[PDB]
């Protein structure tokens, strides 16, 4: 069994900025989800080897996780808030695509996604 390389968190070629919205996505959104009792399965890329999910990276071709998002935000990797919001939405969607309703991992994704939606609802206007 083999894991793919993780998503890119560094790329000098890539245009990037700090925006007040991306600052909010780190200080408020990432921080809120990261500290949650259900955060731990999402704090690093899915280890399909250790979890014995040999089909995971046959089904999930756009993997994403909060470990990757944390590194992208800390490295100021993003151009805009929408790129980062897409990463969160990819993470949740992947969980729902691979797993089935009522699975513990899905209940955990649903709890995190509720908070995500509550926080992004108050994403500030761009400065
Ligand atoms: C980020 C993510 O989603 N990870 C993750 C996953 F993709 C799949 C499974 C998993 O075992 N799915 C099975 C459900 C039942 C089906 O019949 C067969 C597949 C577990 C996962 O997380 C572990 C740490 C976990 C394990 C237990 C509780 C919470 C998290």
UniProtKB/Swiss-Prot annotation:
Site (Acetylated histone binding): 99
Tissue: Ubiquitously expressed.
Signal peptide coordinates: none
Cross-link (Glycyl lysine isopeptide (Lys-Gly) (interchain with G-Cter in SUMO2)): 58
Limits of the Bromo domain: 17-123
Superkingdom of this protein's organism: Eukaryota
The record's account of how the chain is modified after translation: Phosphorylation by CK2 disrupt the intramolecular binding between the bromo domain 2 and the NPS region and promotes binding between the NPS and the BID regions, leading to activate the protein and promote binding to acetylated histones. In absence of phosphorylation, BRD4 does not localize to p53/TP53 target gene promoters, phosphorylation promoting recruitment to p53/TP53 target promoters.
Primary role: Chromatin reader protein that recognizes and binds acetylated histones and plays a key role in transmission of epigenetic memory across cell divisions and transcription regulation. Remains associated with acetylated chromatin throughout the entire cell cycle and provides epigenetic memory for postmitotic G1 gene transcription by preserving acetylated chromatin status and maintaining high-order chromatin structure. During interphase, plays a key role in regulating the transcription of signal-inducible genes by associating with the P-TEFb complex and recruiting it to promoters.
Free-text note regarding domains: The NET domain mediates interaction with a number of chromatin proteins involved in transcription regulation (NSD3, JMJD6, CHD4, GLTSCR1 and ATAD5).
Comment field (misc): JQ1, a thieno-triazolo-1,4-diazepine derivative, and I-BET, a benzodiazepine derivative, have been tested on tumors with success. Treatment with GSK1210151A (I-BET151, a I-BET derivative) has strong effets on mixed lineage leukemia and promotes myeloid differentiation and leukemia stem-cell depletion.
Subunit description: Interacts with p53/TP53; the interaction is direct. Interacts (via CTD region) with CDK9 and CCNT1, acting as an associated component of P-TEFb complex. Interacts with RELA (when acetylated at 'Lys-310'). Interacts (via NET domain) with NSD3, CHD4, BICRA and ATAD5. The interaction with BICRA bridges BRD4 to the GBAF complex. Interacts (via NET domain) with JMJD6 (via JmjC and N-terminal domains); the interaction is stronger in presence of ssRNA and recruits JMJD6 on distal enhancers. Interacts with NSD3. Interacts with NIPBL. (Microbial infection) Interacts with bovine papillomavirus type 1 regulatory protein E2. This interactions may serve for the tethering of viral genomes to host mitotic chromosomes allowing successful partitioning of the viral genome during cell division.
Related illness: Cornelia de Lange syndrome 6: A form of Cornelia de Lange syndrome, a clinically heterogeneous developmental disorder associated with malformations affecting multiple systems. It is characterized by facial dysmorphisms, abnormal hands and feet, growth delay, cognitive retardation, hirsutism, gastroesophageal dysfunction and cardiac, ophthalmologic and genitourinary anomalies. CDLS6 inheritance is autosomal dominant.
Similarity remark: Belongs to the BET family.
Name by which UniProt lists this protein: Bromodomain-containing protein 4
Native source organism of the sequence: Homo sapiens
Lineage of producing organism: Eukaryota, Metazoa, Chordata, Craniata, Vertebrata
Gene (name only): BRD4
Covered range of the whole protein: 44 to 168 of 1362
């Amino acid at each position: 069994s083999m894991n793919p390389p993780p998503p890119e968190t560094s790329n000098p070629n890539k245009p990037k900025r700090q925006t007040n919205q991306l600052q909010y996505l780190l200080r408020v959104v990432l921080k809120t989800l990261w500290k949650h009792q259900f955060a731990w399965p999402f704090q690093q890329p899915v280890d399909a080897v250790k979890l014995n999910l040999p089909d995971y990276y046959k089904i999930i071709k756009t993997p994403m996780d909060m470990g990757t998002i944390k590194k992208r935000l800390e490295n100021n990797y993003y151009w805009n808030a929408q790129e980062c919001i897409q990463d969160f939405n990819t993470m949740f969607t992947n969980c729902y695509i691979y797993n089935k309703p009522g699975d513990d991992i899905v209940l955990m994704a649903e709890a995190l996604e509720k908070l995500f939606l509550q926080k992004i609802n108050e994403l500030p206007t761009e400065e």
